[PDB]
Design a protein around this ligand. Structure first.
Ligand SMILES: Nc1nc2c(ncn2[C@@H]2O[C@H](COP(=O)(O)OP(=O)(O)OP(=O)(O)O)[C@@H](O)[C@H]2O)c(=O)[nH]1
Ligand SMILES: Nc1nc2c(ncn2[C@@H]2O[C@H](COP(=O)(O)OP(=O)(O)O)[C@@H](O)[C@H]2O)c(=O)[nH]1
Ligand SMILES: Nc1nc2c(ncn2[C@@H]2O[C@H](COP(=O)(O)OP(=O)(O)O)[C@@H](O)[C@H]2O)c(=O)[nH]1
Ligand SMILES: [Mg+2]
Lengths: 269, 49, 430, 52, 442, 49, 430
């Protein structure tokens, strides 16, 4: 159960540093002084019942179609044809992290989410508004019932983006976290907007260097625009960074293209 | 740099006697010896004529 | 920078038990000794009061001494008793009998070597030893005799460190022991030579604090010892947490004592709020300062209105502006100028610490050096002279072996201390 | 003999609000973006022997 | 930790039966000496150790000796209910009594029996690791109690030395009387008791009869009631060694606080909530009310009025649910009273004790059940009046040598009467001199 | 998503210097156990194997 | 480098049985003699104490001698008794009677030739012989008399090797034998001329170690003999395992003995601590050094505080840094300089060995040469003089045949040893 990549949970917190049940992943293993190797064949590794539940669960096709059209609606309307910004804003209403260590989706949050796609609307007459309310309620009900729920009737955000964004390898997550760790000079969970401004690489971008179709400073300002809290306090939490890179990883297919653009994006030390 | 010391412990049972009681002015006082310090006086005196 | 605690006698052992409960709570130490806290700020100075035992455990830098183990059996049976190291408990086989001569000369010389071995092990274990801290009553028998014996031996061994004592002194209205004047006079004679700084508490002042300010319906000694443990843990707070204006025990001694014999201070702790009135008064630096100077909040019977302040110190805990602290100390000094000795231009030192005690937004502890303490010594000297002229109970002390000349020396030294306070009260610039 | 008494029952309705933490809140901090005027890199000094 | 009890003669053995009944019922030892097996508390308590020792099979045995010259009372203890509790060596009995003669107990018969008693007490003292005193119960009115009690206390005082010896003593009542020769025995006992006792508590049956008639509702009391009250007092004084409390008081503390000069060691004793069950439901019993009760002369167990003298020291023991602030407020109010006066050389007149264990209730007892109680022992110059009256009775008879031939025949010189009477005269002058204010003498 | 075998641990309220009641008086038996003069090990708790 | 052991008398045979159990456990030798160990480090130096018997077995190079076979029959019936070579048990038919003259002159000279024949066979069997090691009591009869006879014979036949003794000596408070002063005085007279190094242990000191430090409820002679076997196996550990700074019995003698008569030493073993206390104190090099110096952990009744250290040696077992060791020894010499002889610039030798005893993270054995040993010889000389003036029990010894001049020389020689120690204690440079 203590192999590399084994996820297990033990129980409730036994000190004041945590507030809920958490999952732990083994990253290193040493057996230079191990003489009794015990193991049960045809058995799961670790204590990861949630992952098994996700693997054995099946979602309906109409749910997948609804999420496909919802993603299209965000990518066009909320963005400007740029898929990364469109996907980034798609999880705007589920930024809060719970004591479990994962983000939860409520039904009212889902209803507010679907309404923001700017797709279910028409003339401001009374009958048309009622019809739009009925349609958005039906879509939200269809999406909500296709996923497993916990106590207090909420679903998981990661399992949601498994069907919005798609599967993501461990190497991509590791590289994203490495960039975040390098850019964070304190040890809180927030990034400063001035650091993002200083460390981004609009200057060497070919659309500003060899094609001269965009200006470097204007595109830098446009990049500083997309963060939700840049005009008020200038703090970007971990979840927003991971949402942006969820969009980025969803956009690209190949691994080497992803890694090259990821390395070229930030001019860190 | 200084690390810990071991300690042996004194015998003070024979020191305490009822005939030799404490008096005023014989407490333990720790005074460092004076150290002379040389001071330079390169400051030129004011001469406004 | 580490403190070593000594608890002597029944009062000392009980106050020590409550003190170590308060300290273990503030640093999040389980009664098993395991750290279960929630901030690195707690761990980075845990060494100041705890030594580290293997696999997580912490042990308190404390020595418990008593002549009969009854109180120690009560503290070992208590809820936090397990934390104490078994080898730290030093005991004899017969009680002090509330007699100073017995506690100092007969069982004292029998046990003292084992107490010096334990105290030197705790002292040398430290990285950089700061002063010792001792809790005892002066009216008792083992508290007075063994406290002053051990203080004299530690002053011989470690003369460059600080010696600090917390002491209980007899109430002016009702005695708890008949022979209190002899034990008090001899103990004050020992302290004025050996001690660097001494705080005095009257149980009557704590009873009036509990009934009038806290309006407790059924107070117990646990509440009085909790108030004392709160101020004791507060004086050292700047030693073990960050702050805008750090302070240290030696800095308090340097700012409080003008002349070496004048080292007796009054103590107070401010944020006491009544059981049913918290809705009527908001927390603010003026509110803490107003309670800080109210004589109702002082733990001694003498009142400041009959004397003058030579010096005072205030240690603030919490997130607050330095401007409000400085202007409050200026306003109090300017408005009440007649109660401050005029040949010193500023009598109050301030200090500010960032981390308040759990559950309080802000707190301050106040230490005051006031000449009205001369009234207590005069009363004790009167009662001593009444008893000594008639040999009221002297045969116990003389039968143990004491020379009568020791009593006349202690009386003369205390009378000279009262005279010196009276002379400095009425001094003038001319 | 007679059994002992304990007083852990019927507490206040809002006991779970009270905190047990030494530092319940993190420090508040903010940041400002920079306005790139020509003074951002114009007006800087150059080395004493810079040659074309 | 440990204390050894010595019971002498008839009053001392009968009071011992009540005391050991109470200590058994308070700790929980059954009459056969085994703790009940039905209880599953899991913890293995040791508090009994002050009064009981275990063999190893779990039987308990008590730290006491019973001494008598007539067999009947000790054989009644041997055949009674606690027969299996005591070790047979502890119950010592002679063949014939001291016949109300102090001389017969001291010179002729107790001198023969005393070495067995000393050997038993030594065997007890060898099985201790923190002995802190002897408790002695006897009456000075009878022959064996006076003579053998004095001789045994004298031998204990030479052999054990500094160890404290506390006596509970029954003195001759001022009008109730049992024998004609009581003054001679009480004077000759008291002569030995001045030199060889650290604190002596005095009791008179006439006071306990008055207290049981007035406070309790008993029309026809008998000695078992008085003995149960004495047992309650002893339990209150020794509770400080056995249970948790705010202010403990070791047996050595009494001698230091109550005795100003080496001869002035006789103290008065009183107990507060003596009340019947029917009165107990008409009245609350707060700390201040029982503190006010201990100072009324109707509460005393010796027939003397402390209003005819001045106090030198008082020791107040509180047991049960009491808080120190109430004790302090009560004592300050008592200090305010005008009929209570202290000698001017004793400004700090009080010693306090506070223990959490409430008093135990005995199935057939006559006291009500109460949550708190206070007991006081105090030193006062009023005590000089008791000796003065025993003296006139001695002088009136000795003027005609009324019975001296019995004492001289049993081994005593006639000179010993005059020596003892002159020593008690000097004790009377001591009580006159100690009470004179210093302001009058300049 | 269910809680696993180990249980939540509860922590007590903070000890404010005031606002405390006489909880020591709620007991009804105050027998004291002798530990220092008799037990060599004292009441040191060691867990089971 | 092989050691030969000699076990003499009841005390010697009993301590030896436990010693060979401890050594067989450390090298993993089964009671049948079969190797069952789990590391090559155990086998590579097995030759030091064991000879190889056919097909795997090992036999221990030890000679057991006694005048009545009762003890030998008890040890042979024990669980490890089979390992001993049958031909190595030598016994007579009547006891020593606790009389030095009988054990030395009548049955000693009768049996000694068979013991010398066995000892020569054992010495000549070694490829390279190191010193002999002997365990016996000085207060007994056959142990003292026949042990010193054999010591004299081995010093005549092997004067270039080392002679090391572990010896039990009479307690200052209670005697185990009435005629102890005569046997002790004659044995010390023989040892000071013949011996190269002698270690002294008081059974009363082992009782005090068990009761104060280890708090055992029901100790037995097996525990005392286990403490002794532990220290004995510790002194030789560096001879038979690798290490960062090797040491040897001859190198210990060269560093410990300043002058040939001053070869009497105090002994100690550090990680002794009660089962209740172990949770409160972690093992560390400063903790071994603190227990090492504490007189509570020394196996003699004399206390170092009445004397001065001429020299001391510490042998550490385990993989550890040399900076911690050299610094702790410098710190203890500099802090407590009054207890160290000032005309020697460094009194402590250190040695480090990689392999600790099983089940302990670290251990040290301490050997000390301190002048406070003079008070023990003075006490024995006083009791001897008290008995001799009244000719106490002398007819037993004179009936065996001893001349009184032996008694007067032995008393004079011990008195001269006390005087010489006293002179070096109070010596000065001038
Ligand atoms: N309170 C109380 N007083 C008692 C008791 N028994 C006897 N007395 C009183 O004590 C006095 C008699 O003393 P005793 O104890 O009978 O004398 P003794 O010790 O037997 O001496 P001998 O007659 O020589 O054997 C009288 O004043 C009795 O009233 C008792 O059980 N309780
Ligand atoms: N505040 C406080 N005072 C106490 C406590 N116990 C005793 N005292 C006081 O201390 C004095 C008695 O001294 P004590 O400790 O008994 O002396 P000892 O006999 O030498 O230990 C009296 O004034 C008591 O009121 C306690 O727990 N708290
Ligand atoms: N430490 C220890 N001392 C012992 C042992 N056996 C005997 N002694 C002591 O040695 C002395 C008796 O000497 P003993 O061996 O009988 O002399 P022998 O008759 O010549 O063999 C006494 O002081 C005993 O206490 C033992 O196993 N361990
Ligand atoms: Mg009778």
């Amino acid at each position: 159960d203590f192999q590399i990549g084994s996820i297990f949970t033990l129980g409730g917190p036994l000190n004041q540093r945590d507030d809920g049940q958490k999952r732990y992943k083994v990253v290193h293993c040493d057996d230079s002084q191990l003489r009794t190797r015990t193991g049960k064949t045809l058995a799961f590794i670790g204590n990861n019942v949630s992952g098994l539940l996700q693997q054995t669960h099946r979602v309906s096709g109409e749910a997948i179609d609804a999420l496909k059209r919802i993603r299209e609606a965000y990518i066009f309307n909320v963005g400007n044809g740029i898929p990364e910004v469109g996907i980034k804003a798609m999880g705007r209403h589920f930024r809060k992290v719970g004591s479990d260590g994962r983000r939860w989706m409520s039904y009212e949050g889902i209803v507010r989410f679907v309404k923001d796609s700017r797709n279910f609307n028409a003339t401001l007459s009374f009958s048309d508004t009622q019809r739009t309310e009925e349609d958005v309620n039906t879509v939200a009900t269809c999406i909500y019932n296709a996923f497993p729920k916990n106590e207090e009737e909420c679903i998981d955000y990661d399992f949601f983006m498994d069907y919005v964004r798609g599967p993501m390898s461990q190497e991509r997550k590791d590289a994203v976290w490495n960039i975040f760790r390098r850019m964070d000079y304190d040890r809180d969970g927030n990034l400063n907007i001035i650091d993002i401004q200083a460390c981004y690489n609009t200057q060497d971008h070919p659309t500003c260097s060899v094609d001269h179709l965009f200006q470097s400073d204007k595109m830098l300002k446009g990049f500083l625009t997309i963060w939700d809290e840049n005009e008020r306090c200038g703090l970007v939490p971990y979840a927003e960074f991971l949402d942006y890179y969820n969009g980025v990883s969803a956009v690209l297919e190949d691994d080497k293209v992803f890694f090259d653009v990821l390395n070229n994006q930030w001019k860190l030390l | 740099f200084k690390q810990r010391d071991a300690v042996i412990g004194p015998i003070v049972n024979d020191t305490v006697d009822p005939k030799n009681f404490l008096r005023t002015g014989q407490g333990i006082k720790h005074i460092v010896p004076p150290v002379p310090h040389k001071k330079q006086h390169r400051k030129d005196f004011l001469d406004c004529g | 920078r580490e403190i070593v605690c000594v608890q002597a006698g029944q009062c000392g052992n009980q106050i020590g038990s409550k003190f170590w409960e308060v300290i273990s709570d503030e640093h999040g130490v389980d009664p098993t000794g395991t750290y279960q806290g929630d901030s690195d700020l707690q761990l980075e100075r845990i060494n100041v009061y705890f030594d580290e035992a293997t696999g997580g455990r912490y042990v308190p830098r404390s020595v418990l001494i008593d002549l009969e183990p009854g109180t120690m059996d009560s503290v070992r049976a208590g809820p936090y008793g397990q934390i104490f190291r078994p080898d730290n408990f030093i005991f004899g086989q017969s009680g002090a009998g509330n007699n100073w001569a017995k506690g100092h000369y007969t069982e004292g010389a029998e046990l003292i070597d084992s107490v010096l071995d334990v105290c030197c092990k705790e002292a040398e274990s430290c990285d950089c030893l700061q002063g010792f801290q001792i809790c005892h009553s002066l009216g008792g028998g083992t508290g007075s005799g063994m406290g002053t014996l051990l203080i004299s031996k530690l002053r011989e061994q470690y003369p460059d460190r600080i010696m600090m004592t917390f002491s209980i002194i007899p109430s002016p209205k009702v005695s708890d022991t008949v022979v209190e004047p002899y034990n008090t006079t001899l103990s004050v004679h020992q302290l004025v030579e050996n001690s660097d700084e001494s705080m005095c508490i009257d149980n009557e002042a704590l009873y009036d604090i509990c009934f009038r300010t806290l309006k407790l319906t059924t107070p117990t000694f646990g509440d009085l010892n909790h108030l004392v443990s709160a101020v004791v843990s507060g004086v050292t707070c700047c030693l073990r947490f960050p702050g805008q204006l750090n302070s240290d025990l030696r800095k308090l001694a340097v700012n409080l004592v003008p002349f070496p014999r004048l080292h007796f201070f009054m103590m107070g702790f401010a944020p006491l709020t009544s059981r049913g009135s918290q809705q009527y008064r908001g927390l603010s630096v003026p509110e803490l300062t107003q309670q800080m100077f109210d004589a109702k909040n002082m733990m001694q019977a003498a009142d400041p209105r009959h004397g003058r302040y030579l010096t005072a110190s205030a240690l603030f805990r919490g997130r607050m502006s330095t401007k409000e602290v400085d202007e409050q100390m200026l306003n109090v000094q300017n408005k009440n100028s007649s109660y401050f000795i005029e040949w010193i231009p500023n009598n109050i030192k301030s200090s500010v610490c960032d981390i308040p005690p759990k559950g309080l937004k802000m707190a301050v502890t106040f230490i005051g050096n006031n000449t009205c303490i001369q009234e207590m010594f005069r009363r004790v000297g009167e009662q001593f002279t009444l008893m000594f002229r008639r040999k009221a109970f002297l045969h116990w002390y003389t039968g143990e072996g004491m020379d009568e000349m020791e009593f006349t020396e202690a009386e003369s030294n205390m009378n000279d201390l009262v005279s010196e306070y009276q002379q400095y009260q009425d001094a003038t610039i001319e | 003999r007679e059994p002992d008494d304990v007083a852990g029952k019927k507490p206040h309705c809002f006991e779970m609000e009270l905190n047990r933490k030494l530092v319940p809140f993190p420090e508040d901090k903010t940041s400002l973006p920079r306005i790139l005027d020509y003074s951002h890199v114009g007006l800087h000094r150059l080395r004493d022997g810079a040659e074309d | 930790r440990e204390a050894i009890c010595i019971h002498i003669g008839q009053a001392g053995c009968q009071v011992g039966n009540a005391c050991w009944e109470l200590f058994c019922l308070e700790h929980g030892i059954q009459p056969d000496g085994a703790m009940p097996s039905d209880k599953t508390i899991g913890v293995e308590d040791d508090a009994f150790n002050t009064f009981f020792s275990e063999t190893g099979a779990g039987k308990h045995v008590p730290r006491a000796v019973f001494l008598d010259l007539e067999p009947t009372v000790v054989d009644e203890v041997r055949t009674g209910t606690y027969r299996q509790l005591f070790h047979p060596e502890q119950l010592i009995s002679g063949k014939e009594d001291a016949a109300n003669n102090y001389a017969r107990g001291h010179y002729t018969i107790g001198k023969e029996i005393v070495d067995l008693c000393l050997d038993r007490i030594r065997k007890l003292a060898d099985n201790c690791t923190g002995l802190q005193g002897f408790l002695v119960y006897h009456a000075v009115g009878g022959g064996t109690g006076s003579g053998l009690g004095a001789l045994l206390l004298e031998r204990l005082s030479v052999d054990y030395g500094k160890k404290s010896k506390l006596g509970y003593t029954v003195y001759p009542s001022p009008q109730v009387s049992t024998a004609v020769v009581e003054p001679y025995n009480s004077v000759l006992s008291t002569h030995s008791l001045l030199e060889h006792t650290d604190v002596a508590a005095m009791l008179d049956n006439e006071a306990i009869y008055d207290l049981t008639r007035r406070n309790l509702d008993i029309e026809r009391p008998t000695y078992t009631n008085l003995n149960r009250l004495i047992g309650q007092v002893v339990s209150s004084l020794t509770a400080s060694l056995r249970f948790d409390g705010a202010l403990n008081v070791d047996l050595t503390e009494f001698q230091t606080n109550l005795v100003p000069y080496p001869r002035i060691h006789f103290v008065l004793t009183s107990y507060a909530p003596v009340i019947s069950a029917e009165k107990a439901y008409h009245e609350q019993l707060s700390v201040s009310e029982i503190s006010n009760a201990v100072f009324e002369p109707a509460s005393m167990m010796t027939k003397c009025d402390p209003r005819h003298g001045k106090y030198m020291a008082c020791c107040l023991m509180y047991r049960g649910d009491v808080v120190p602030k109430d004790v302090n407020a009560a004592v300050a109010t008592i200090k305010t009273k005008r009929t209570i006066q202290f000698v001017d050389w004793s400004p700090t007149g009080f010693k306090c004790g506070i223990n959490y264990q409430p008093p135990t209730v005995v199935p057939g007892g006559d006291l009500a059940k109460v949550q708190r109680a206070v007991c006081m022992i105090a030193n006062s110059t009023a005590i000089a009046e008791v000796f003065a009256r025993i003296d006139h009775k001695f002088d009136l008879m000795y003027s005609k040598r009324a019975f001296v031939h019995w004492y001289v025949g049993e081994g005593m010189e006639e000179g010993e009467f005059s020596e003892a009477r002159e020593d008690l005269a000097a004790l009377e002058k001591d009580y006159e001199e100690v009470g004179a204010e210093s302001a009058d003498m300049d | 998503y269910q809680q696993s075998r180990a249980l939540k641990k509860e922590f007590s309220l903070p000890m404010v210097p005031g606002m405390t009641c006489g909880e020591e008086m709620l007991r009804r038996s105050y027998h004291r156990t002798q530990v220092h003069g008799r037990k060599y090990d004292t009441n040191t708790h060691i867990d089971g194997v």
